[PDB]
């Protein structure tokens, strides 16, 4: 993996866990991170996809 595509997922998963907490399954957010680092996601999706 390119380092850029690998730091992205790390920072995204940190924001997602910070927003949701226990309400977000770790493997569930890890899938959000993969999607939003390949393609541009909106802010609302990022902040709520793991815990509406």
């Amino acid at each position: 993996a390119p380092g850029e595509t690998r730091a992205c997922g790390r920072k995204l998963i940190s924001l997602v866990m910070a927003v949701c907490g226990d309400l977000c399954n770790p493997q569930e957010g890890k899938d959000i991170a993969t999607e939003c680092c390949g393609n541009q996601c909106s802010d609302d999706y990022i902040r709520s996809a793991c815990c509406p």
Partner: protein, 208 residues
């Protein structure tokens, strides 16, 4: 709506004297937050200053401004005089959050040379910044010494133009951000004593 939340709190600890010790806190905040440090209620690092200039540049836009900021406090030669209450305080203009820890030094500092002429250290930085395409975003770095700032994107040097602006306080201003700006930006602080490096991250969010 404004929100501020601890990602990594200070924890109380009993520490060996004379051995360098580093505290760290991470804070998620919308809008962007600043971190300062206190020892027994007295300020010892950082400031209350917010990035009001970027708010002006984005005035009248729909702002995301969400992300995590981080800060480290280094205790060079822990002695009994350093035992006390340490607090990391985050602040975003609306709310204030504070994480407190009792750090007690256990032992004596028989031999310890706290080199004031040591390398500079990046003691506050934008861990992540999320912002909407078309807006201005800012990546922050702050150092413990007087330094000259240089920023790198994808192993290329960042130069001042009408999009990027390297400020003298350590900010990297990026105007009219686009999805290709996504990625890691390294901030480099250089002086006569050494150089410090620290990675930051920018994510332009889709504009719906």
């Amino acid at each position: 709506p404004a929100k501020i939340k601890i990602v990594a709190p200070l924890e109380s600890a009993l520490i060996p004297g004379g051995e360098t010790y580093q505290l760290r806190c991470d804070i998620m905040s919308t809008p962007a937050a600043t971190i300062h440090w206190k020892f027994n209620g007295k300020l010892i690092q950082g400031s209350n200053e917010l990035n009001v200039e970027e708010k002006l540049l984005n005035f009248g836009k729909a702002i995301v401004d969400t992300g995590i900021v981080a800060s480290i406090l280094t205790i060079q030669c822990p002695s009994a005089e350093n035992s006390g209450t340490y607090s990391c305080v985050g602040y975003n203009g609306h709310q204030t959050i504070e994480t407190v820890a009792e750090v007690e030094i256990e032992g004596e500092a028989s031999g310890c040379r706290s080199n004031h002429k040591s390398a500079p250290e990046i003691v506050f930085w934008t861990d992540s910044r999320f912002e909407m395409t078309g807006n201005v975003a800012t990546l922050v770095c702050r150092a413990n010494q007087q330094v000259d700032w240089v920023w790198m994107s994808n192993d290329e040097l960042v130069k001042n133009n009408d999009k990027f602006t390297v400020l003298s306080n350590g900010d990297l201003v990026i105007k009219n951000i686009v999805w290709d700006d996504m990625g890691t930006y390294t901030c480099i602080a250089r002086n006569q004593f050494g150089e410090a490096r620290q990675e930051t991250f920018l994510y332009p969010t889709a504009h719906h």
